[PDB]
Amino acid sequence: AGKKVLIVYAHQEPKSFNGSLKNVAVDELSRQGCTVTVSDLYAMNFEPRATDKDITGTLSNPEVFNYGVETHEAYKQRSLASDITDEQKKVREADLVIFQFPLYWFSVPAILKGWMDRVLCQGFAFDIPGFYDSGLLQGKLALLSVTTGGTAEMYTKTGVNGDSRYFLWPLQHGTLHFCGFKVLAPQISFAPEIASEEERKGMVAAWSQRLQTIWKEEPIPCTAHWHFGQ
Amino acid sequence: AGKKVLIVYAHQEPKSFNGSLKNVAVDELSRQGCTVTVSDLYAMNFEPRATDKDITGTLSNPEVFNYGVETHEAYKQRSLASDITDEQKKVREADLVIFQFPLYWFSVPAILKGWMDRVLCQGFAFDIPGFYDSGLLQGKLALLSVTTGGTAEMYTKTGVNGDSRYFLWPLQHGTLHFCGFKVLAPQISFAPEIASEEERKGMVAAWSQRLQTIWKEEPIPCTAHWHFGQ
Numbered sequence: 001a002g003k004k005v006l007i008v009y010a011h012q013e014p015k016s017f018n019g020s021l022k023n024v025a026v027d028e029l030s031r032q033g034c035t036v037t038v039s040d041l042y043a044m045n046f047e048p049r050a051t052d053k054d055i056t057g058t059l060s061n062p063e064v065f066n067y068g069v070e071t072h073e074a075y076k077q078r079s080l081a082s083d084i085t086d087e088q089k090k091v092r093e094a095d096l097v098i099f100q101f102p103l104y105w106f107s108v109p110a111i112l113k114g115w116m117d118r119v120l121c122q123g124f125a126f127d128i129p130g131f132y133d134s135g136l137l138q139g140k141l142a143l144l145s146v147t148t149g150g151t152a153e154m155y156t157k158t159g160v161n162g163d164s165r166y167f168l169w170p171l172q173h174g175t176l177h178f179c180g181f182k183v184l185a186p187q188i189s190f191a192p193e194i195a196s197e198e199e200r201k202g203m204v205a206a207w208s209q210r211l212q213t214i215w216k217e218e219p220i221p222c223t224a225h226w227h228f229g230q
Numbered sequence: 231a232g233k234k235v236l237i238v239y240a241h242q243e244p245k246s247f248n249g250s251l252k253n254v255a256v257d258e259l260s261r262q263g264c265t266v267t268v269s270d271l272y273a274m275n276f277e278p279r280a281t282d283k284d285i286t287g288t289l290s291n292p293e294v295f296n297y298g299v300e301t302h303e304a305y306k307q308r309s310l311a312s313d314i315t316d317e318q319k320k321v322r323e324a325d326l327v328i329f330q331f332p333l334y335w336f337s338v339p340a341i342l343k344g345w346m347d348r349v350l351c352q353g354f355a356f357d358i359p360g361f362y363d364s365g366l367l368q369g370k371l372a373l374l375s376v377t378t379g380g381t382a383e384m385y386t387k388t389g390v391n392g393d394s395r396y397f398l399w400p401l402q403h404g405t406l407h408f409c410g411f412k413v414l415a416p417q418i419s420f421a422p423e424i425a426s427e428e429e430r431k432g433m434v435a436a437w438s439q440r441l442q443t444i445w446k447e448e449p450i451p452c453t454a455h456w457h458f459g460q
C-alpha cells in the first residue's frame with residue numbers, strides 16, 4: 001500500500017487522446033488508493049531552455065558558463081530555480097513516473113525534453129559515481145506512454161520507420177536507465193488519429209487494464225539487445 | 231555557383247567548445263567563399279514549445295487543438311508565427327544545414343528539439359505522401375556536429391552507452407531523412423571536458439580540416455543497417 005505516482009504530461013489539448021490516456025491513469029491509480037500528481041507541462045508554460053536563469057545567486061565560474069557544471073553545483077548549494085526544484089520534489093517522492101506524450105520526431109516533444117534536460121541534473125538524477133544501475137533514482141519505476149502518428153505496421157524492423165524499439169533507446173536507456181530508473185515496458189498506442197472509434201476505445205481500455213496490475217510488473221532488461229537485438 | 235550554409239547552433243556560451251566548433255565552421259566556410267548564416271538559438275531566445283501561439287489565423291478546429299493539423303493549414307495559408315517562417319527561409323535557401331550542439335540525454339538540447347518540432351512542419355518539410363526519399367527538403371544536405379561528455383569508448387557496441395550510431399537514429403533517420411535531406415557523416419567530438427588542451431585543439435582543427443573538402447563528400451546510406459549493423 002501507499003504508492004506514489006507522478007505523471008509528466010505533454011499535450012496541449014485536454015480533449016486529446018493523450019489527455020484521455022492521462023485522465024484514465026489518474027482515475028484508475030486514484031481508485032486504487034495511490035497518491036497521484038500530474039505535471040501538466042503546457043498548462044504550466046514549463047520552461048524548456050537550459051539557461052543561466054536556472055541558477056539563482058552567483059555562479060561557480062561566471063567567465064565560461066557550463067550549464068551541466070553550474071546546475072550540479074547549484075543543486076549541491078540549493079540554488080536551483082524553483083520550477084526545477086518543484087519538479088525534483090515530485091520525482092523524489094514518486095515510486096513511479098509515467099511520461100504521457102505524442103511522439104515528436106522519434107522522440108519527446110521539446111517541452112518534455114526540456115523537463116528531462118533541466119530536472120534530471122547531476123547530483124539529483126545521477127553522479128560520479130551513480131549512473132545506469134546505480135543512478136540516483138534507483139528503486140523508482142519509469143514508464144513511457146507514447147502515442148504515434150504511424151501505425152504498428154509502419155514501425156517494423158524492415159519497415160520505413162524501423163522498429164519502435166529503435167527510437168526508445170535514447171529515452172529508456174540514455175535517459176531513464178542512466179538515472180537509475182527501472183524501466184517498465186512502454187505503452188505504445190499506435191496511430192489513434194487513423195484508428196476507428198472502436199480501436200481507439202480498445203487502446204484506452206488496454207491502458208486502463210494494464211494499470212490495474214502495474215505494481216505486479218517486472219521491468220524490461222534495458223539493454224542494447226532488448227532494443228536492437230533478436 | 232557557390233554554396234549556401236545554415237548552421238543551427240545550440241549552446242549558451244560563446245567561449246565553449248561548441249562555440250569554437252561553430253566559429254571555425256564560419257571561418258572556414260567563409261574563407262571558401264560560401265554564403266553562411268547562423269541561427270544562434272539561445273541568443274535568439276528561440277521558442278521551443280509547440281503551442282497554439284504558432285498559428286495566428288482562424289483555427290481549422292478552434293474547439294479541439296491539433297498542433298500538426300493546425301500548423302499544416304497555417305503553413306499553406308501563411309499564418310504561422312514569423313519566428314517559424316524566418317527559420318524556414320534560412321533552410322529553404324541553404325544547400326547544407328549543419329547542426330552544432332552538445333549531446334543532451336542522447337539527443338539534442340530542448341531548444342534545438344523545439345526548432346525541429348516547430349520549423350519542420352507539414353507542407354514545408356514533408357507532405358503525406360512526400361517523405362523520406364520524397365521529402366520536401368530533397369536536394370539538401372544535413373550534418374550533425376555533436377559533442378559529448380561520454381568517451382569514445384563508452385560509445386561503442388560493447389561500451390555501456392552502446393554505439394554512437396544508435397542514438398543518431400531519431401535525428402538522422404526519424405527527422406532529417408524523413409524530411410528528404412541526404413545526411414553527411416556525423417562529426418562527433420568526444421569528451422572535450424575530459425580531454426587535454428592539445429586534444430581539444432586537435433578536435434577543433436580536425437573539424438576545420440574536414441570542412442575544407444566537405445563539398446566532395448557523399449552522404450551516408452541512412453538506413454537501419456548503417457545505424458545498427460546486421
Ligand SMILES: Cc1cc2nc3c(=O)[nH]c(=O)nc-3n(C[C@H](O)[C@H](O)[C@H](O)COP(=O)(O)OP(=O)(O)OC[C@H]3O[C@@H](n4cnc5c(N)ncnc54)[C@H](O)[C@@H]3O)c2cc1C
Nearest residue numbers: 016017018020102103104105106147148149150192200298
Ligand atoms: C511536431 C510533430 C512531430 C511528430 N513526429 C512524429 C513521428 O516522428 N512519428 C510518428 O509516428 N508521428 C509523429 N507525429 C504525429 C503525432 O505523434 C500524433 O499526431 C500524435 O501521437 C497523436 O496523438 P494525439 O493525442 O494528438 O491524438 P488526437 O488527435 O488527440 O486523438 C485522435 C482521436 O482520438 C480521439 N479521442 C480522444 N480521446 C478519446 C477516447 N477517450 N476514446 C476514443 N477516442 C478518443 C480524439 O478526439 C481524436 O479524434 C508528430 C506530430 C507533430 C506535431
Ligand SMILES: Cc1cc2nc3c(=O)[nH]c(=O)nc-3n(C[C@H](O)[C@H](O)[C@H](O)COP(=O)(O)OP(=O)(O)OC[C@H]3O[C@@H](n4cnc5c(N)ncnc54)[C@H](O)[C@@H]3O)c2cc1C
Nearest residue numbers: 068246247248250332333334335336377378379380423430
Ligand atoms: C542536460 C545535459 C545532458 C547531457 N547528456 C549527455 C548524454 O546523454 N551523453 C553524453 O555523453 N554527455 C551528455 N552531457 C554532457 C555534454 O554533452 C557535454 O557537457 C558537452 O558536450 C560539452 O561540450 P561543451 O561545448 O559544453 O564543452 P566546454 O565545457 O565548453 O569545453 C571544454 C573546454 O574546452 C575549452 N575550449 C573552448 N574552445 C577551445 C578551443 N578552441 N581549443 C581548446 N579548448 C577549447 C573550453 O574553455 C572548456 O574549458 C549532458 C550535459 C547536460 C547539461
Ligand SMILES: CC[n+]1c(-c2ccccc2)c2cc(N)ccc2c2ccc(N)cc21
Nearest residue numbers: 067068069071072120121122335379380423
Ligand atoms: C556536465 C556534467 N554532466 C555530464 C558529464 C560531462 C563530463 C564529464 C562527466 C559528466 C553528463 C554525462 C553524461 N554521459 C550524461 C549526462 C551528463 C550530465 C547531465 C546533466 C547535467 N546537469 C550535467 C551532466
Ligand SMILES: CC[n+]1c(-c2ccccc2)c2cc(N)ccc2c2ccc(N)cc21
Nearest residue numbers: 105148149150151161298351352358404408
Ligand atoms: C503527418 C504526421 N507525421 C508523421 C506520420 C504519421 C503517420 C503516417 C505517416 C507520417 C511522421 C512520421 C515519421 N516517421 C516521422 C515524422 C512524422 C511527423 C513529423 C512531424 C509532423 N508535424 C507530423 C508527422
Ligand SMILES: CC[n+]1c(-c2ccccc2)c2cc(N)ccc2c2ccc(N)cc21
Nearest residue numbers: 127128131378379380381383384421423424
Ligand atoms: C568512464 C568515462 N570517464 C568519465 C565519465 C564521463 C562521462 C560520464 C561518466 C564517466 C570521466 C568523468 C569525469 N568527470 C572525469 C574523468 C572521467 C574519466 C577519466 C578517465 C577515464 N578512462 C574515463 C573517464
Ligand SMILES: [Zn+2]
Nearest residue numbers: 173177222223
Ligand atoms: Zn538501459
Ligand SMILES: [Zn+2]
Nearest residue numbers: 403407452453
Ligand atoms: Zn534514414
